[PDB]
Structures are given as structure tokens and as C-alpha cells.
Amino acid sequence: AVKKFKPYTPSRRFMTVADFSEITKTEPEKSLVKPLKKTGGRNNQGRITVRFRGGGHKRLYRIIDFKRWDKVGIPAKVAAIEYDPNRSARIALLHYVDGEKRYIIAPDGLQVGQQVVAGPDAPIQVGNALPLRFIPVGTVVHAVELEPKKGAKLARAAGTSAQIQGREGDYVILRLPSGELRKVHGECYATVGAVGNADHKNIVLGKAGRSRWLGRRPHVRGAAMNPVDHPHGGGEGRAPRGRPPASPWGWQTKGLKTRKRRKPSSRFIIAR
Amino acid sequence: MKRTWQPNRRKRAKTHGFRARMRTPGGRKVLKRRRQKGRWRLTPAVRKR
């Protein structure tokens, strides 16, 4: 839906906030299962190695369930859907009959009170997790494992999915959010449905501060700098570059493919 | 204005203390040099309890 504001201030005239109506009466989270201390820090042991990180709201990590094959066969009741500061998506709090409480990343269409479960069994319904094999060709799916028993790694961003395209002996072909065509092992779990919160892309930050709230420090142009700092630094009053556009570290930034050629992963990929 | 000396007993101790110098080869040599020199004070005297 997206919340919109009137221009009672500049920067309030474009600003735009998510709709939280799917956030069920459960705004503060769940101890026990999560949260952990989350360790803010824009850099490695010592030095900054990703520029322009820092500031922005304190967070608690929700330790979510990315391998659903523990509770094969054990169903769970979806108890709530809550805000997760550390991902684009929303998260489902679910209660297993087992007693155990996990969070699943919350797919589009998930309703509270719903039944959900994981395993070879598993009715093909939104919320359920299955090894890729038993899932019908052509159904859209998410939180897909890359290699079996290694955890969900594909399609967890808000409003993303992959579609099952066909099969090939032990592998089923996937079409990933990027549009790539991937052979992913049959035995990999993946949960049916799309991610949801799909209006995430429609949000307009609206002002500088908002950027900072999310811990995004000001990014400065190479043009703004000096020859010591950047290939684009200097010279006089503005300058068009004077070389093929580059990163600060000298590599070209328009076109230069960067995936290493001889990756053994290659023989499992069929697209862009 | 604000000058450059902003005394702190803990800082002076953690920074220039006998135990800091002892911790690394760089520092151990400092004690060696100061000893051979005949320095009355190997490290700065940080006070208080």
C-alpha cells in the first residue's frame, strides 16, 4: 500500500513509509528463539573495508530458520508476523506442536493461524518446505538451498522468488530472481511461495537522514576528490573523467566482468 | 582553546605503562634503551589508587 505524507515539510513531500498492516499485534519480538546481540561495526580487524558504513539505529538480530529439515513432518501454527530490522522481508513467528518456536521468513499470503510444515510429505501450499524434487515443475518457490543441507541462500529478499523450470537427473533447473538459470540439486529444500512485502521497492526514503537511520554513510564521488584519492580526482573546474570510468582502486566500472572464469560452479549455470 | 594535553591517569597507564611496553618487541627495546641509558624512570610515573 505504502504510507504517503503531505508536504507539511520539504522532504516530507516525497517521503514514504511501508504499510505495517501485516504486522500482527506483536511489534516487540520474542526472546528465547532470538534475539542475539548484533555486532555493529563498519570494518574488519582494524581498517574499513566497505566504505560509508555506520551510524543508524541499534538492532537486535532475529536468529531465523534457514534449514527447515530439522522438523521434517512436524507441523507448526503460524502465531504472528513481525518487523525484522535486519532484512527487507518480514518474519513469521511460528509455534510447532512440538512446543518449539522458530521464525520463518514470511512469504506473501501467509495468514496467522495457518498450518505450515516441512518434508517430502507436505501439501504444496504457501509456507511449506520440500526438497526441490517433489515440488511440481513451474511452481514458484523461495528460501532455496544451493547445495543440500547447507541452508536457504536464494530468494529471501522482499518480493523475490524463483520458479522451477524443469529437471535433469538429480538436478532441477531454477530461474533465480536475477533471471539466471541454475541447476540446483534435487535434494535442496525450498519453501513454496514468493517472499512478500513486495511494496518494499516502492518506498521513497525522502531525505538524507532516513539514509543515515539505516546506517548508510554519505558516499562521495571520485570526481569530488583528488588524484591521490581517486582516478577521477582533479583536475580543474569539473572534469569529464579522461579515462575509462574506474573504481578508486583502478579497475574499470562500466562493463568489466568480474566473476572468475574457471569457477567449478560454471557447469551448473545456464544464464545471465 | 582546547590544547593537546588532556591528562588521564588510566590512558597514560594503558598507553605508556611498564606492562604495555613489555607486551611487544618494539616496547621491550625501549626499556632496554632506557636501562642502558641509566634513566631513573623507565616508564612515566602515573599516580593515584
Next chain:
RNA sequence: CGAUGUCGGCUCGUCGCAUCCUGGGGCUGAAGAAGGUCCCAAGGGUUGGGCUGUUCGCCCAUUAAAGCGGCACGCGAGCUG
């Protein structure tokens, strides 16, 4: 070049005369009045504004006239910038 601060303005001046005005004079194609033009003469005078950093210049309203030039393109241990 072990430093002579460099435009313009301002402030204060002072000097040259190849005189802008005033005083004296010759010639005039000088009727008179007003001019032209040369010579004598610097004692005093030589306005206020619009534009531009401007010097200069062009305008506006005047004036007896709105002189030219030197003084480290006079003058920053005097000011401005």
C-alpha cells in the same frame, strides 16, 4: 632578488608652463557684440553628480573656467584593498 610593496581611490600637498579661466597686448577675411589666432603672464582659481576597480572616457546639471604634466605612473613605518 640576506625584498626598492606593485593599480586605482583617499588624505595632504608642492613644483614646471608648452595657460583651461581671470589680467596685458599684436594681427584678423576685427562694424558692434561675440569669435579666430599669435605673443606677455603663472598671482589666485580650476564645481557637483550617473556608469565602471577603473586610469581614461561618455553622459547629466552647472561654470569665469571644469588646463596639461613632474614629484619611485608624488604620497600603504598615513588610510583603504
Next chain:
RNA sequence: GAAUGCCGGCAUGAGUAACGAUAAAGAGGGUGAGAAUCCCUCUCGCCGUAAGCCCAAGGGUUCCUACGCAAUGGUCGUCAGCGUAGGGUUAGGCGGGACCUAAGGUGAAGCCGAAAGGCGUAGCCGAAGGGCAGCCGGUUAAUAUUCCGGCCCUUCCCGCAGGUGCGAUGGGGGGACGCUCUAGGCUAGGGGGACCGGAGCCAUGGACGAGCCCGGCCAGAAGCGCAGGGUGGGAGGUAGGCAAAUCCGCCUCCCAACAAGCUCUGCGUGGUGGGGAAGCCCGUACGGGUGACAACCCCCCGAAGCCAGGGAGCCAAGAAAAGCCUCUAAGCACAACCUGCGGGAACCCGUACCGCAAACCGACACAGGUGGGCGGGUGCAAGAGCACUCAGGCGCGCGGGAGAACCCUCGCCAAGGAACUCUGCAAGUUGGCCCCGUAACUUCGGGAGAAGGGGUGCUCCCUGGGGUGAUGAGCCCCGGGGAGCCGCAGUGAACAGGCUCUGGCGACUGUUUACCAAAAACACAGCUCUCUGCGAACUCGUAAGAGGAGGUAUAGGGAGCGACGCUUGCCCGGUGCCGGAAGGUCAAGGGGAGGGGUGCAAGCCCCGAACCGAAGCCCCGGUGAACGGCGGCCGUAACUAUAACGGUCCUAAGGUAGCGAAAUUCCUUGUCGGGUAAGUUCCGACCUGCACGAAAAGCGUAACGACCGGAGCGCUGUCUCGGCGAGGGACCCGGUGAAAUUGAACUGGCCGUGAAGAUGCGGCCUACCCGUGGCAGGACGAAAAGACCCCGUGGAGCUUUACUGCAGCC
């Protein structure tokens, strides 16, 4: 004898500048060898959201007392933060440690690295965070939540007494959390009182009066009362909580739905204890006595604090561990644990004084810098603002006269009102509140405090709401109406927008050259390109490892552009990148036709042609929000002028839209029109654009701006054009007393001359010896071994299709 030489000593400027905020002083009396400067008293002035008080940091003896003044103090010094000596810092409850965990550090296992060393789950360390039992008074010259008094607590250990399955570093629960706005009831704190207590006081015209003045509090266990916080009770089933569990979790039934009940805080009250003014008298540097058997009561205002884990809303989604409760395991159930009650035990370190400052950071008793808490009263709409002022603390460690110039800070001014100047720079005008009243334009929010106005004091009368109170008096908040008084003037002082029109740039709040640039630069939401399938790309590291990310294409890196509106044309020839299992070239290696050296030979050893050989390059393509680029010359219409039209050369393609003498226009003050009396600026146009142009974006845009340009009104010392007054210096007297500079000096003008600008040489002219206040023209005056310029086979930063390497990638 010179090196702007090195070290030291003493000169010159010079009794000169200064003596560190313009808050301010005067006198009388003491002490003393010596008083503007020390003590005391009286008067005056200054601070008072401090210039007062309480903590933290830092400092470390500066605290208190006695004796002292050589030095230290910008003067003096009998004084001191100074010299000499002596004294002073008392804790189970305050803070820190025999408690916990944060970032981070360290680090067993483990990983890595020529060595040194780098990492690293556990653990350990790490605190203004969590945990934790003290309040009110009295005493010292100097310490007290520490000593003492009163009242109140907490831990251990040993006993008895009564309970129960007790029992872990292990399970769960809890601890436990954002921002903004907030209700109810309280406390802190403050105002009023005809009420209560009190020494006293009638002045100078009047008042012996609900007269003036002073004070009417503090703590306090149990128990109560008032607020408020926490929380459901049962019974079964159970596969989860990494062994167990009665615990938690999930499910299913019953009873509550409530704070009803348990509790747990806060506030009142409480046995009791403590304090208790002015004034008056004293002898202290200061405190003492009395006032007192002090009284210790009623209203009102009232928090930002408390009840606290209260409530509502919002998006950016808000530490951990221990203590604590509960569950059980090994064990043990003569142990053990819980509750009550006795007795006993309760260590280590800090405690002085300064602490917005003369004791901390600034070489100084330096006008600068320094985190937290309290910060009273009156008014002005409010307030921590402003004026005065409690408490308290100061008059800033040189003074006395004088009343020139000139300077600083300040006040006023005839007439004129920007004529000043690069510029209204500066300075004035404006100014709070209430009420009228407000345009273009606009993104419908705005522009707006538009502009422009009027009201503002005090008195008396009438009258409307609330709050606390019983529905009432009072006390306290907001209003309305009518008469009336005074002055030049009523936010009568102090605090408190000058306004408008129109361009440029940037959308906007923000950021920046600490110490000459706050901007039109940077950032910014948003737009596009491109890389990246996840052991991601990328960054750091030799590696291990880590960041990215406990993320996963709506995500992450790189690039440019930079809200938004309308748009962003053409060229892929060159360069870059992307795509091409053909082809050409292509190194080590494979291959050996063939040849060479030695041997009597077997042999041993050398070169070495075909041919098989990667990436890279060549070649074939694509690709512009990739690096980039986007022409010339002649002719032509029935007045001239001009050229819709045409020819021709060249390119990879020849600039579209929209702008345009512009932050861009050389010629140039282009040419018309506008503002002016007059306008190289400004605005509107024209287009001959030296040399605009579409994401190094193009043309626009409401709002925004300590940005930059032009205009007008208002107002003025900016000016014509100055004048006067004020205080701080300047000046004279007493005390203290520098500096750069300095070859030596007995240091005049003119015209000359001289290395070409002479006090010093020539000729003349002038001129008695020496100071004080002033002005700066000269001493090519001081200051800095010129910044600019060249020089040096001097040096650095930076760039690239300069050379040559290296990392990195292939």
C-alpha cells in the same frame, strides 16, 4: 675580526611601552622598624541559571596553626596559594575491590606466518551500564552518610526452634531496555496569612496600627491510610527446551476476568529524636550567649523529580551477563535447604584542600578551554530570557593628579537625506504582546510576521468562566462591558524583525579549507549504467583470517547525475568494455629432418628444420546516462534586401529540442527597448554563439539561503561638514620596568657628482648647546638568505598511449 658563526657577559632603544578586562571606591581605628595594598568597623559599587553551592576529572600538601619576608606576587606588603616547623584525611551500609557482563583486549583448543609475530568458538580481563544494606542531627583550628547521638538496615559463621525431598558452573523464568506526546496521585521547591512565636522600633509631616521587621521546620522502624507497579487459578496429554524436570513450551478441557487476591514500590502518618530568626550583648582572624519552655499552624502555586516495568502514538524497531525465582542430575537424605530467634565475625583502597579555576589544560596569579547536579524573590505573555535583588561571593595585586593632540568604547545634533563608497561597509530606522488586514505565484503545505495598520499606563463601577475548596468563603488562573485620571511619551527602564520589487546559482535541513575562502564547492533524497548465484563481487591481510553479512538480485559493491516538471537528438570510424569452439601471429614444453665435438669403437655431449603447442594481439561483430565527436565553399525570388530552393567538396556523423553578448561574448559600453536628470552595472529583447546545448545533463521551477547582482521606500554622522560631550589610554608625579634593532658616528638644505636616487664626495646655502609633546617624508627605515623570474645535469606531489620494473589479474 667578520661565517644572519658557537657559549657566556654587558650595552642601546629607556627610566621608554607596559603593570592582563572601565565591577569603584572613601574614611575611621588597629598592628608594625616600615601601610593606598594586612586586620577590624562604617559608607559605596559588582555578580547572583553566578562572579553562589554540591560532585566528577585532573592536580598532589596547595588544607589548618605557629614563627617569618631574601626570593616568588607585574607596585607595596606586617599579607599569601611563598620560606621553616607542627598538626590534620577515621566507613560492614558512600565510592572501588574479595559480584556481573559491553565495545575492546587477552586467549586454552585450533589455524597462519622466514624470525619477530598474526589470528582465534570457550574462558578470563574490561564500566559514569547491571547488582548491592543509611537517614536526620552534634561536634574539630583542620575530618566526618567515616567520629558521637538518635532512629534503621545487610552479609557471612555457630547455635538452638519449626518446616521441606534437599541439591548445580546445568533447564527455564526474570533481569530486559527505543523515540515523541502523555493521565491520575504525590514529593522537591516556592508565594500568602487577619493565625502562632519573637527581641525590639514610632523617626522627618502623619500612623500605637488585622503597623514595621524576623521566624513559623527536619528525620523517623513496625502499624496504618492514600496513590500506583507487577502478576491469573485448576486438571490432564506431551515427541520441544541438546541428560533429567513437577519447571518452561505446545495442545485440550474446566473456573477468574477482575488488579477481586497475593505481593512490591512511592507518598502521607506515625514511638521518638533533632533543629529553631531578626535584633540585642560580646573580644576572637571569627564564632559565642540571649532572644525560646521559641512557635513550629491554615491556605495557595507546583515540577522536567517520585509511584516506573504507568499509558497512547510512531518507524528507524530499540545491550549483555550475574544477583534473584523455579526445575531437576550426579550425589546425599545422621546430610542439606527454607523461616524465626540468639550469640559471634564483617578485610583491602579512596576520604585533606582547589575544582568554570591564582591549585585542572594553556612556559605566567594568562580576559581562552573544561563533564554532572542545586541555582531563591519581584516584575516584564512565558522561560534557565531581561532589569533589580536573597543566600553567598567579589571590587579582577600598581597608585596619585591632570582634562592637549590623537586612538579606542560611547551619547547627541541645525538643514539636506546615500550626494559617501568597490558596496548603505558601518551605524541608524524596525522591534514584545493582543487585534484588524494582507498580493503575484504555488508542488495547495505555502509565500505570511507578506505589506500596512490600530491597541498597550493607572483609577473606579458592573459582569462571564474555570482550579482548590462542601454545592460557600477565601486563595489562584484565564475573560467581557462602562465611565474616568496624568504625562511629550504607558512592552514610559532592560531583553525583542527595517521592508519591498527583480535577477544569478544551488531544490530544500545539512557538510567543509582546526589557524585569511561557509560558497554557486561537498553531501543530500531521487535517476541511470555496470559488476555480483553466494566460500558473491569488492576491500584489508604474505597467510590464517575478517569485513561485505550471521545479508542473498526488492540484495551487496563500483560509477556518474543530483528534489521536482518537461525532456535528454545523431555518429560505434579511433579508444575502452562486451560477444565470436574460424583464421594469422604467439612462449616454455613436445617433436625430431638434419649438422657438429670427442672416442678404436661401443658410446658420451652439443646445436637443430618440418610439425603439434595458451593467454595476449591481429581479425569479425556489438555497445554512448562507455572515453569521446557532432563541417566547408559558391549560386538563387518581377525595387532593393534577404534566401524557403539549388550545385559541389569532405566526414564516422556533420549540434535536434531548448537556451543564448550568458558565472560562457574576443571585437564590446554590440544594437534596440526599460529603470536614471544622467546607468561600461542591472532587467527585457534581437542573434554576427571568438568559444551554450541536453545525466562533467539541457531548459525551467514554488519553497529555502549569514551565498552573488540590480532597484525603490523607510531611516540615518556614510556624506555635504563638521561640532560638542562621556569614559579608557595618551600627558605630569611616586613604584616596578621590557623589546625588535644596533659597523662606528661629532648623523643639515640645494644643485651636482659618484655602481646610474648622498648627512659622509664638490661647490654653494644654512645652522648657538640640550631636551619634551607631536607628524611620518627620508635614513633605498625594521622584519623574513624573494614567494614571482631564471639558474642547479637540486627535491618533492601529481598525470599519462614516457622508460623500466612490481603488486594484481589472465
Next chain:
RNA sequence: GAGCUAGCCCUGGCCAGGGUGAAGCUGGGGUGAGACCCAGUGGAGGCCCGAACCGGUGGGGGAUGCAAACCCCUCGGAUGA
């Protein structure tokens, strides 16, 4: 050597008093149901005025200074990047 300065990490603190009045809620109105429109409440915002506090805009002083960045007047921000 990060006790100055730049950034980030952990844990705390601070921001008087006034304005303006977004959403939402509630009531009324409109419709077949709506959209929407009026009140009232509510209290949003890199919103406004203004102390602390953080700055450093213009001018003047200071220039062997009080100060190797100071002082006066004036000005920007002040719930947020």
C-alpha cells in the same frame, strides 16, 4: 604517537519557554455502497521564534596581544544528518 584532530564501536548524559497544527480518532453531512466535505479532538515535522548548548556571518578592536585564533557588537543551528 588517535590524552589534539577525523571516523566508527560500547555504555551514559543533555536540549528553558513559546509558536504552527499532518495523520489518526470521534461526531455531523453526502452516496446504492463510496470517494469526498465540515467541525471537534489529536500532537506529526532533518517545521517556525528563542536561551542553554553546538557554531563562526559581517564589521570594529587586538598585532613585542588577555590570547602562537583572543575580545565587543552582529549573525547560523538549536528533536536532529
Next chain:
RNA sequence: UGGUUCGUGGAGCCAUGGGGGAAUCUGGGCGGACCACCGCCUAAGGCUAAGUACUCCGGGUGACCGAUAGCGCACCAGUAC
């Protein structure tokens, strides 16, 4: 690749990171590419006095200093600052 006078040189010897990879006296290395002859040595384990270097320290001597010299310090100096 390093070492040696040896910088790729006709480049051996000695050491070694990578690849291949023997022999036990009729076995192996060397005598400067290489081959023949003639010789010299016995690799792939280790220890081993003395002659040699140094002067914190003690002594001796000086065509060495004599307090701006001589050590930074003749003096309570790696102190004060």
C-alpha cells in the same frame, strides 16, 4: 636462483626452491663447457682444544685534555629542565 674475481659469459665448482630420479669399489664426485687419456679425492650423520675477535670490569703507561678542554656528567647527571 644464490655464493666465488665471475654481472649468462665458452660458466665450471659449492649451496639449493621445482620436476624427473641411480648405484655400493668393475661404486661415485672433482681437476672451468664437452669427450678421451692421466691423475686427486671418497658426498648425502656428528663432535673436536690452541693460535683469533671484543673490552662492562681491574691494573699499568702517555712528546693525551686541564673545567668553552677532557666522557653528555671532575660538582650526588642521563639529573634538573
Next chain:
RNA sequence: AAUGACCC
């Protein structure tokens, strides 16, 4: 695979 000066 273009064009047909003016008025009548």
C-alpha cells in the same frame, strides 16, 4: 514518372 503566367 512534375508542371501549364494574368483577364475575358
Next chain:
RNA sequence: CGCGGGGUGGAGCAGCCUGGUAGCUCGUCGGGCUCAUAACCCGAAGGUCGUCGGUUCAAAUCCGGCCCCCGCAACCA
């Protein structure tokens, strides 16, 4: 003032560097197609190569001096 590129029939361009021959397109002229004009078709004409000088057997071409034309440069002060 400096630099380096340029003047060829009526128009626009080649031809030069490796000296001897001046060629392309348009236009002009004559004829044809058409009722006529243009388009189209067939034939033809047309160039002191800016001037001055000589180098050569011979100069559009090579070399000097001037003259117009175009483009660049004019910086540190």
C-alpha cells in the same frame, strides 16, 4: 608581429609529395523526346593554374619575394 594551411574553365573540387598527360560533378552551347517546359537521351565547346623572378632540356607541380584567404598562437608578470 609569430606560426602553417590555401588561391586551377562559369560554380565546386581533383591533379603537386615519386617534374613532361590537366581529370570529376554541375553549368553553357547545338540537336532529339513533348502541344509546351522541366526531367531524360545524343553531340560539342570551354582552363594567362594569385602575381614576380630560375631551377631544369621541360614547372600547375620544385625553390625564393610579395599579395589577398583561412586556421592556430600571443604565456609568467
Next chain:
RNA sequence: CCGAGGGUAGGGCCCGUGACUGGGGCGAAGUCGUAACAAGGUAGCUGUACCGGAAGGUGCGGCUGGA
């Protein structure tokens, strides 16, 4: 008290004029092309959109006022 009017301040409507600029009407024999009327030599006309000296072309849908 009110009050003609004068003054100051800001709006509303209307008239005139303005460098320059936009298209329009009209004016016997100037320029360029051929769009339409015959299947006008690409059926035309149409709304919209883009492009072009100019008529105009093209895309998309539509109409018979064409076969």
C-alpha cells in the same frame, strides 16, 4: 459622536501604449515543390502520436463521404 474631503497602504476590473514576438486577413502575371479532385498515379478522410523547407509522411485505431 458622526461627518464632505484630503492623506497613507494594499487589492479588484477596464482603457491606452511598449523593444520584440505569434499567427491571421487581403493585395492581376515573383520562389519551391504535387498534397487533394479520375484507383490523382501510395483510396481518401479522421482522433491521437512522432518526424519533415513546404504541401506533408509514417504508426495506431476508426469511418464510406472508395473498389
Next chain:
RNA sequence: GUGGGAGAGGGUGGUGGAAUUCCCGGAGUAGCGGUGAAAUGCGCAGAUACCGGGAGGAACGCCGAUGGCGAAGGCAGCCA
């Protein structure tokens, strides 16, 4: 009102085949495209033509009419 009838009337969800294009494998050569005629273009780096597999979007042939439905604009594979 009761009881019936035809229909491409509308909205939502799902689904079928023919064909075009692109990708992959096979087999296969010297030209294919295109027009008034050509050229641009694609193709010896393996094109066009043919077979097998896959991806994907769009529009529904025959039925079909000079037909039906709707207020017009307009409505056409099938299913609910």
C-alpha cells in the same frame, strides 16, 4: 410473480493447440532474404531448407454468417 429460452454482454481465476522468434542437439551443404528489378542484410566462424528438445510472449484458424449480444465505446480458443 411463476415457469422457461438464446447470446463473442461484463469481471475474476485457470487452461489448450497451430504458428513466429530465440536457445540446445542432430543431420546437411553453397547460398539464403528480398524486389518491378535490385541492393542493403544473413551465410564456409556451418546460414537457408529438415528432424528432435526447450524457453517465451502475443493473437485465437476451421466453426463464422450477408449471424449473435450490449446503452454506447465495444465483445470471439476452452473451462469453472
